Amino acid sequence: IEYSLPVPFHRFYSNPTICAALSDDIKRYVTEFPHYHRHDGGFPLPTAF
């Protein structure tokens, strides 16, 4: 966990569960907005991607 960084970069590879497990900021984000937890590509990617 300490050496791992999550990279949600594609609508096929952005699983919010893994990112929330690996990153605390993403965990807080998903906690605030539970509807983003879904897996249909509706999870917001960073503005760059």
Binding site: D25, R28, E32, Y36, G41, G42
Partner: protein, 49 residues
Amino acid sequence: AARRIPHFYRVRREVPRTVNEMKQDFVVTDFYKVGNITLYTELHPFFDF
């Protein structure tokens, strides 16, 4: 980008839903009804607006 990814989710603000994504949740029959807001963008089969 990889390091900045946590910083994006650091701020707990939701993002607007893109129009192309909004089209996907109409069923085959009510896509043509007046309730389909997005119809004003569906001008060409081969192109997006």
